[PDB]
Design a protein around this motif. Structure first.
Motif, mmCIF file in Angstrom:
data_model
loop_
_atom_site.group_PDB
_atom_site.id
_atom_site.type_symbol
_atom_site.label_atom_id
_atom_site.label_comp_id
_atom_site.label_asym_id
_atom_site.label_seq_id
_atom_site.Cartn_x
_atom_site.Cartn_y
_atom_site.Cartn_z
ATOM 1 N N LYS A 93 46.437 16.907 17.562
ATOM 2 C CA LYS A 93 45.132 17.622 17.637
ATOM 3 C C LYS A 93 44.118 16.758 18.388
ATOM 4 O O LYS A 93 44.101 15.545 18.149
ATOM 5 C CB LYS A 93 44.589 17.925 16.236
ATOM 6 N N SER A 118 45.472 26.404 23.151
ATOM 7 C CA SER A 118 46.234 25.163 23.421
ATOM 8 C C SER A 118 47.271 25.456 24.496
ATOM 9 O O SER A 118 47.377 24.677 25.468
ATOM 10 C CB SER A 118 46.856 24.630 22.182
ATOM 11 N N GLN A 158 47.494 23.768 28.137
ATOM 12 C CA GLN A 158 48.748 23.054 28.458
ATOM 13 C C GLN A 158 49.275 23.565 29.789
ATOM 14 O O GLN A 158 49.721 22.739 30.595
ATOM 15 C CB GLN A 158 49.783 23.210 27.350
ATOM 16 N N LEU A 196 41.954 21.470 20.246
ATOM 17 C CA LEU A 196 43.203 21.965 20.860
ATOM 18 C C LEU A 196 44.357 21.101 20.358
ATOM 19 O O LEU A 196 44.089 20.047 19.756
ATOM 20 C CB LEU A 196 43.062 21.885 22.381
ATOM 21 N N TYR A 197 45.585 21.562 20.582
ATOM 22 C CA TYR A 197 46.833 20.848 20.236
ATOM 23 C C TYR A 197 47.557 20.524 21.546
ATOM 24 O O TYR A 197 47.589 21.368 22.471
ATOM 25 C CB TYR A 197 47.657 21.670 19.247
#
Lengths: 48, 48
Positions: free
Chosen positions: A4, A29, A33, B7-8
């Motif tokens: 996180k 996320s 990404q 976010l991850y």
């Protein structure tokens, strides 16, 4: 292996990201990404 | 006008981002913002 991380965005930009997330039925996320995976090389070529 | 968002990331990916941040003397947020600005169009063309 997940981790996180709090980031800061302009309002406009966060909303742009969330629009793509819901359109694609994705997490925030996951979209960010994919942005990294796309941009990595161009960014790794930035200077100083 | 700024806004905070958790976010991850995969470990590997977070470390890749931080490497570019310190190389460029930037915040994490700024590098990720540049990744979005670069990738937006390609992503906005993803399907369903």
């Amino acid at each position: 292996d997940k981790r996180k991380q709090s980031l800061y965005f302009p309002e406009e930009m966060l909303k742009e990201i969330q629009e793509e997330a819901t359109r694609q039925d994705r997490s925030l996320s996951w979209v960010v990404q994919q942005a990294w995976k796309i941009a990595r090389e161009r960014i790794k070529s930035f200077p100083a």
